[PDB]
Amino acid sequence: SHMYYSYGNYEAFARPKKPENVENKSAYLIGSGLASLAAACFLIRDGQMEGSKIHILEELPKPLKGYVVRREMENHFECLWDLFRSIPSLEIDNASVLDEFYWLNKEDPNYSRCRVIEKQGQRLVTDGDFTLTKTAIKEILDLCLTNEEDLDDVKITDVFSDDFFNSNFWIYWKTMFAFEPWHSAMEMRRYLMRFVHHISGLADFSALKFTKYNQYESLVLPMVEYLKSHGVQFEYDVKVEDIKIDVTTSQKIAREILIDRNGNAESIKLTINDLVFVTNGSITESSTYGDNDTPAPPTDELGGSWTLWKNLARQSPEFGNPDKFCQNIPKKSWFVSATSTTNNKEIIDTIESICKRDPLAGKTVTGGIITINDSAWQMSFTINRQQQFKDQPENEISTWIYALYSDVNGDYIKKPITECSGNEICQEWLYHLGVSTDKIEDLAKHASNTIPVYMPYITSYFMTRAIGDRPLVVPHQSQNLAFIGNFAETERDTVFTTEYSVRTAMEAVYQLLNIDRGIPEVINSPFDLRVLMDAIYELNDHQDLREITKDSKMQKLALAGFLKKIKGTYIESLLKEHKLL
Amino acid sequence: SHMYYSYGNYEAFARPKKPENVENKSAYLIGSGLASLAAACFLIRDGQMEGSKIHILEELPKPLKGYVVRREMENHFECLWDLFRSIPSLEIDNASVLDEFYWLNKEDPNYSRCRVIEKQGQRLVTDGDFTLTKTAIKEILDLCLTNEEDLDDVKITDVFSDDFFNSNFWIYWKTMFAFEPWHSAMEMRRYLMRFVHHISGLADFSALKFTKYNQYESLVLPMVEYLKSHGVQFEYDVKVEDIKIDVTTSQKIAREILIDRNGNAESIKLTINDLVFVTNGSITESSTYGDNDTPAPPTDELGGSWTLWKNLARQSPEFGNPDKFCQNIPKKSWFVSATSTTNNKEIIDTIESICKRDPLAGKTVTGGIITINDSAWQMSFTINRQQQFKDQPENEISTWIYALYSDVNGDYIKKPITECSGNEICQEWLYHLGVSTDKIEDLAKHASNTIPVYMPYITSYFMTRAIGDRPLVVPHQSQNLAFIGNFAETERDTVFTTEYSVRTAMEAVYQLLNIDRGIPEVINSPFDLRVLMDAIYELNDHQDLREITKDSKMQKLALAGFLKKIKGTYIESLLKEHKLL
Ligand SMILES: [K+]
Ligand SMILES: [K+]
């Protein structure tokens, strides 16, 4: 009740008055992920909180055998662009991160010239088409017409049938977003509605936008410099074990942060004027690393992030249900990603022959993942603009590889990916590029350096869930406690996105400080009739309403009577404008 | 083809690169109205044109007997807020005009406590309700469903019948926007679609927002100071008589500006790199002024603005058809407005008794016009926050009065308003406030000072028109010539608004300089299903779909079958959210 949603330039460009009594308030942010950093930025810029009163608590201190790549953006990351228009670029003078990003993606717009391959390097013949049947389209629409409240614990396989899963649409969708068939239909529905304005860019990634470098260099480092320039305090080697919260009949008040500061057990006592921002849960927690000759050791370890959320959930069911997300994760789930770095011309030339661009040119390369449709692992890989690390040699590329299925033997390396060294993952990948099999072993072992990473929780955002499993950003009656990040709850936005991190941060800061400025709503595209007309046209692989209805009597007649009632009206002009007539 | 429309924060917050070759370009803006000033501001900020190369050409030089008041804003003036977030306030340090305006309208939000009066000072009993019948509602919707291309030269009386014109809706609508029954149905349609998101605020003005002072002090003066601080050149006593334009088979190029600079006939020769921004036509041209004892003398004079547009239209029909707007204006049209200033407690107390607020308190007073429904003149009046001039005595108010009908005897002063002195207009107004008739003459003649103004073209924006009567902002193949202001043509936006002035200015500058940043589209509210649901609910005076259909078989049955097919779905939840179920 302490915020309101808005849209349009009035609320975008307006500045909030300094919030009431902020001069006597402090902030503690648990973890240094994007959501914590964003919340600190809003605390500085819009809360006008004093930097020395803002404390970022990081578990790690202030050696992997190679480069490791970790996601993209779209124009309607409304909250994220509100943030980064205020963060100075570290690459361009007198320019924001938004400016640098905006100009770069106009100079070198992202698109894919090859989205799906099969048969050891051949482009899928129907690449670019959705190959959705009428039944599959109806299931998509029926899911969207289902209330979110009726999708508690429903799996994607509960709402779609064979036609949909055989479609190219599902190939594009599951791989670009990392949906597994057992994942949350509720989240899949949110994604369908959230990105409906970009349906025309699904097959070719033409709606995706990327930073110049990896996320740490292009997003985190600029935020850090901004926060440091305003005196914000960074606390390393601090493990938050619990937060004692009073949950009374009238209020929720965080009372004390129980920490281990460099082996020493200490405690931070809080008043109502000391705000606590918890990033509950983590998809990168407990990650392990291999090298070119060693697999990343599988693990089920619960780290500090999941232990902390469990300790908060013990104090109120309003603080969420972490076990839905970190327990009972199927062993087929995506766990392993790998970064394969090479300067070898044979590999780089093979990539060029598939993606149609020079990987070393410094512009778009694959334009997003290429999916190997017939790979047992259901592997995809991408090469961003190179190099993605500013100190990497200019003759090197780093390729990011991931597998949706973790418990199935590969086609060339006949083992599950979880049993594979870096070079074995690279060999399986090189096989599917069409590299001659008598060269694969040496090119992977001696011409490349591949670092695998095992992430027990990388699919955790998407686990089947029920309303209530995620805490509200500001739980009911909370006075000084907020939850931020991709396991907190807010309307219609989609998790596994950087936008969701910034949105929850902004909503938390605005609500706890009662900031008198609107939060931009999730973009209104699923309510926009023009966008919905485009979606019907795109989903039906570019067929007008007559062609859609051509083989059915019940519809071909309803359409005849509809066209007779709209003839010569604005509705007919709109349908013609959007190619439905 | 030299611009694109956008929405959302990405394009709002992004800055355009410096446009190509702007260092060798100059700009001439004809007139110093809002559109010219806005275009100069965009030339500085986004064109990065040198201030000394920007020339504002004003006909007047660098004595009325009293104060003269001249409109409001809404949140979705998308282009105007893009502009004024960059203009420094002259009232608050380190703040924009947008900030000052945003904070003021949150501190003192606008609303009316009395919108319509009758019978010499009594509130209309049904004030607040639209009193629209089903037939009237159907005509509203049928107009919106008509293509704009089918409304050439159609009058409002061609598309509405008796029920609509007897509605409270039409009272609110015609007076707040100054529509006459013979005005353009095309523009009325644009207004219905343009402001559909504010239908719930039509009766009480709760969607209106106002500057602190009159428009000159709160909008023009800040822009002027901004332009002067950047070296922009202001040219006074310059009358533009013509612009010689080459209209070839391949290009339109302005060649020379023919001027009279202080009685001297001179000429400004232009290259392709010299841009010309013409504000074609004017609603204030040829205005005459009276005083407390003298009517403003009626006139049909064509001034420099209308002569110039006629001289441009002689060179291409693509430059518009001014005669549609400045000729054959019916003599019943609104011509006269008056500003009545008083410090008299009897008058001020009578106003307080009607509007329910202290006129001298410095906050909202009437919250917008009060309409005298049974006045022969169809008179309305408003009192903004006082005082509206920063050097006015603190015990004074200034009331703005206007009459939609100019050729009908008044109820107390039995003469058309065009024959009335300032004090006679005030007397007619005081009669309709319920002032005792034995006091009206002395309170108007000796306790008030009323300045009338006769404006032959004040209704000119709304004259019946056809596609093509207004020039495109940048006509086809124009290299260096643009048209801006409320007689230029752009999609869906509404004239008689300051937003239209800023929009045309922005579109002209962006197109002529090929600026690489989106222009915000007219707000998408008529395509937003949520907004349309609200509109149905509001237009039907807050009745759900069952009550709307209760007295009809064809609809009450179609609704039964519709409800049976949407039961338990998201569509039903949406309808319930918006009170239609
Ligand atoms: K905002
Ligand atoms: K924009």
Q: Which is catalytic among the residues B28, B67, B172, B191?
A: B191
Question: In chain A, how long is the greatest CA-to-CA distance?
Answer: 79
Q: How far apart are CA A71 and CA A216, in angstroms?
A: 12
- Count of helix runs (H) and strand runs (E) in chain A: 21, 18
The shortest CB-CB distance from A570 to any of B85, B145, B568 is to: B145
The enclosing domain of B411 has a CATH number of 3.30.9.80
- Give first-to-last CA distance, chain A, whole Å: 45
CB A488, CB A282: distance < 8 Å: no
Q: Is residue A344 part of a domain?
A: no
Q: Could you tell me if A537 and A505 lie in one domain?
A: no
Provide the 3-class DSSP secondary structure of residue B257: strand
The C-alpha atoms of residue A445 and residue A437 are separated, in whole angstroms, by 13
CB-based contact B39:B279 (threshold 8 Å): no
The partner residues of B209 in beta bridges, in order of sequence, read: B73
Q: H helices within B58-114, ranges in order?
A: 78-84, 97-107
Tell me which residue in A12, A103, A530 faces B527 most closely, judged by beta carbons: A530
A17 touches A516 (CB < 8 A) = yes
Instruction: Name B446's Cβ contacts closer than 8 Å, sequence gap at least 6.
Output: none
In this structure, the strands spanning B5-6 and A336-342 are unpaired
Query: For residue A366, how far is the Cα from the chain centroid?
Result: 19
Q: How far apart are CA B572 and CA B563, in angstroms?
A: 8
Alpha helices in B149-195 (DSSP H): 156-159, 162-165, 168-177, 185-194
Active site residue B72: yes
Residues B327 and A116: their CA atoms lie apart, in Å, by 65
- The residue count of chain B comes to 581
**Residue A356 region, left (φ>0) first, then alpha (ψ -120 to 50), else beta?**
left
Helical H segments across A26-167, by residue range: 34-45, 78-84, 97-107, 134-144, 156-159, 162-165
The burial class, CB within 10 Å (0-12 / 13-18 / 19+), for A246 is: exposed
State the nearest Cα–Cα gap between A184 and chain B, in angstroms. 18
CB B205 within 8 A of CB B355: no
Which is nearest to B390 in space by CA: B210, B217, B211?
A: B217
Contact B103 A523 (CB under 8 A): no
Give the HSE-up count for residue B375: Cα atoms under 13 Å, Cβ half-sphere: 38
> Containing H/E element for A559?
helix A553-566
Q: Are residues B434 and B340 in the same domain?
A: yes
Q: Which of B409, B455, B141 is nearest to B300 (CA)?
A: B455
CA dihedral of A429, A430, A432, A438, whole degrees rounded to 10: -140
Burial of B559 (0-12, 13-18, 19+ CB in 10 A): middle
Nearest C-alpha neighbor of A355 from the set A27, A123, A82: A123
Tell me the chain A residues in contact with residue B527 when contact means C-beta distances shorter than 8 Å.
528-530
In terms of Cα–Cα distance, which of A124, A118, A129, A251 is closest to A199? A129
CA-to-CA distance for A86 and A81, rounded, in angstroms?
A: 9
Q: How many CA atoms lie within 13 Å of A100's alpha carbon, on the beta-carbon side?
A: 21
Tell me which chain B residues have a C-beta less than 8 angstroms from the C-beta of A17: 103
Residues in chain A within 8 Å Cβ distance of B530: 524, 527
Side-chain half-sphere exposure of B280, counting CA atoms within 13 A: 30
Residues 6+ apart with CB under 8 A from A1: none
Query: Coil, strand, or helix at residue A390?
Result: coil
Domain for residue A46, yes or no? yes
Chain A: closest CA distance from residue B401 (Å): 30
* Half-sphere exposure at residue B498, Cβ-oriented, CA atoms within 13 angstroms: 24
**What span, in angstroms and rounded, lies between the C-alpha atoms of A266 and A381?**
45
In a domain, A309, yes or no: no
Residue B530 is part of which domain span?
Answer: 525-577
Cβ B367 vs Cβ B400: under 8 Å: no
B13 closest CB neighbour out of A85, A106, A530: A85
Q: Is B498 annotated as a binding residue?
A: yes
Decide: residue B24, CB within 10 A, 0-12 exposed, 13-18 middle, 19+ buried: exposed
The annotation status of A71 as a binding-site residue, yes or no, is: yes
Residues 6+ apart with CB under 8 A from A289: A64, A68, A296, A451, A452, A453, A454
Query: Burial level of B307, CB count in 10 A (0-12/13-18/19+)?
Result: middle
Q: Is A439 helix (H, G, I), strand (E, B) or coil?
A: helix
Sign for the CA dihedral angle at B116, B120, B122, B126 comes to: negative
Please name the member of A9, A85, A147 whose beta carbon is closest to the beta carbon of B82: A9
Look at residue B428 and tell me if it is in a domain: yes
CATH of the domain at A506: 3.50.50.60
> Ligand 1 centroid vs A520 CA: distance in angstroms?
5
Q: What is the DSSP letter of B342?
A: E
Domain-located, residue A557: yes
Are A99 and B75 within 8 A, CB to CB? no
Helix ranges restricted to H, A317-466: 323-326, 345-355, 422-432, 437-445
For residue B300, with 0-12 CB atoms within 10 Å meaning exposed, 13-18 middle and 19 or more buried, which class applies? exposed
- The SS3 assignment for B246 reads strand
Catalytic annotation, residues of A: 72, 191
- For residue A74, give the chain B residue with the closest CA: B10
Phi, psi values for residue B96, rounded to 5°: -90, 170
Q: Are residue B346 and residue B445 in the same domain, yes or no?
A: yes
3-state secondary structure B517-561: CCEECCCCHHHEHHHHHHHHHHHCCCCCHHHHCCCCHHHHHHHHH
Which residues, including other chains, have CB under 8 Å from residue B392's CB and lie 6 or more apart? B67, B398
Report CA Rg, chain B. 25
CA gap B455, B406 in Å, rounded: 11
* Helix H or strand E encompassing A402: strand A397-403
Sign (positive or negative) of CA dihedral A21, A22, A23, A28: positive
Distance separating alpha carbons of residues B403 and B336, to the nearest angstrom = 7
**CA distances (Å), origin B464, targets A569, B155, B186:** 21, 6, 8
Chain A partners within 8 Å of B146 (Cβ): 569-570
The CA A502 to ligand 1 mean position distance, Å, reads: 13
| Resolution for the entry shown, Å | 1.8
Domain count, chain B: 2
Distances (CA, A) of A442 to A201, A431, A435: 38, 12, 11
Could you tell me how far CA A308 lies from the centroid of its own chain?
Answer: 23
Distance of CA B248 to the CA centre of its chain: 36
Q: What is the dihedral of CA B336, B342, B345, B349, to 10 degrees?
A: 30
- Which residue among B426, B454, B482 closes a domain? B454
Last-in-domain residue among B437, B454, B471: B454
Let me know whether A511 and A529 are in one domain. no
The distance of Cα A462 from the centroid of its chain, to the nearest Å, equals 11
Q: Does residue A99 sit within a domain?
A: no
Q: Which residue of A has its CA nearest to B82?
A: A9
Q: Which structural technique was applied?
A: X-ray
Which residues on chain A place their C-beta less than 8 Å from a C-beta of chain B?
Answer: 7-15, 17, 75-78, 81-82, 85, 95-96, 98-99, 102-103, 106, 144-147, 150, 516, 520, 523-524, 527-530, 568-571, 573
Q: Locate tokens 């006082």: which residue?
A: B386
Show which of B429, B454, B479 is a domain's final residue: B454
Q: Is B501 marked as a binding-site residue?
A: yes
- Whether residue B549 lies inside any domain: the answer is yes
Q: What is the DSSP string of A210-272?
A: --SS-HIIIIIHHHHHHHHHTT-EEE-SEEEEEEEEEE-SS-EEEEEEEEEETTEEEEEE--T
Transcribe B466-510 into DSSP letters: -TTSS-BSS-TTBSSEEEESTTSB-SS--SSSHHHHHHHHHHHHH
Query: Is residue B480 situated within a structural domain?
Result: no
Q: Which helix (H) or strand (E) holds B269?
A: strand B264-269
Q: Do residues A272 and A92 touch, judged by C-beta distance below 8 A?
A: no
Query: Are the C-beta atoms of residues A75 and B8 closer than 8 Å to each other?
Result: yes
Other CB atoms closer than 10 Å to residue B89's CB: what's the count? 20
What is the Cα–Cα distance from B5 to A573, expressed in whole angstroms?
Answer: 20
How many residues would you count in chain A? Answer: 581
Give the separation between CA A195 and CA A199, rounded to whole angstroms. 7
